[PDB]
Structures are given as C-alpha cells and as structure tokens.
Amino acid sequence: MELAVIGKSEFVTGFRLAGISKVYETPDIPATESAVRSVLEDKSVGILVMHNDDIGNLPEVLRKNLNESVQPTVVALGGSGSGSTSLREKIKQAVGVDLWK
C-alpha cells in the first residue's frame, strides 16, 4: 500500500525528506479538487489521509458526498477532536392541543 496525504505544503516538506509519504498541498478550497483528481485513483492504492482544516470547507458539498462515497480510507484530521454537545426538552402537556384538534 502507498501513503497518500492531503494537507499543506510544509506538510509535504516534512515527509518528502524521508520520501516515505506522499503528501499534497491544498491551500484553497477550490484548488482541493485538483488533488482529488489524483486521489480518485490513488484512493484504492493504499491508505489516504486528509486534513479537515480544508475539507470541512465543503460540508454539504464534500463531507456530504464522501459521507456515502467513503469507500477508501480517507483519514481526516481535525473536525471533532475534543469538544462537547447539548440537549433539549419539551412540555408534554402541549399534546393536549391534539385532543381538541
């Protein structure tokens, strides 16, 4: 298997040293499509790894599409990491309105 990564430039410069890790650089959200063209075929070659720091830009666009097209191993970095959530509640009694309705 090969090593495919999609992040910044400085990222590829680090791995390029050992030559044992192919990393890309997608500074712009639109330019990302460029690297995706080479990944569409290099996705089933080994392990893939991207950075949500650029992918997140396309939620309902990418995150949504890949959500079901996540065939290969797209290791996305970031996105969640370590955060929290929330909750809610109702009144219940409100249902009484459905009685008169």
From Swiss-Prot:
Could you tell me one molecular function GO term of this UniProt entry?
Answer: proton-transporting ATP synthase activity, rotational mechanism
Membrane topology qualifier: Peripheral membrane protein
pH dependence of activity: Optimum pH is 5.2 for ATP hydrolysis.
Q: Which GO terms describe its cellular component?
A: plasma membrane
Coarse class of the protein's main subcellular location: membrane
One GO biological process term: proton motive force-driven plasma membrane ATP synthesis
* InterPro entries tied to this protein: ATPase_V1-cplx_f_g_su (IPR008218), ATPase_V1-cplx_fsu_bac/arc (IPR022944), ATPase_V1_fsu_sf (IPR036906)
Any Pfam family matching the protein = ATP-synt_F
Presence of the UniProt keyword Membrane in the record = yes
Q: Which of UniProt's keywords are assigned here?
A: ATP synthesis, Cell membrane, Hydrogen ion transport, Ion transport, Membrane, Transport
Free-text function comment from the UniProt entry: Component of the A-type ATP synthase that produces ATP from ADP in the presence of a proton gradient across the membrane.
Q: What else is known?
A: This organism has both a Na(+)-translocating F1F0 ATP synthase and this H(+)-translocating A1A0 ATP synthase.
Describe the subunit structure: Has multiple subunits, A(3), B(3), C, D, E, F, G, I and K(x); there may be a few other subunits as well.
Q: What is this protein called?
A: A-type ATP synthase subunit F
What organism is this sequence from? Methanosarcina mazei (strain ATCC BAA-159 / DSM 3647 / Goe1 / Go1 / JCM 11833 / OCM 88)
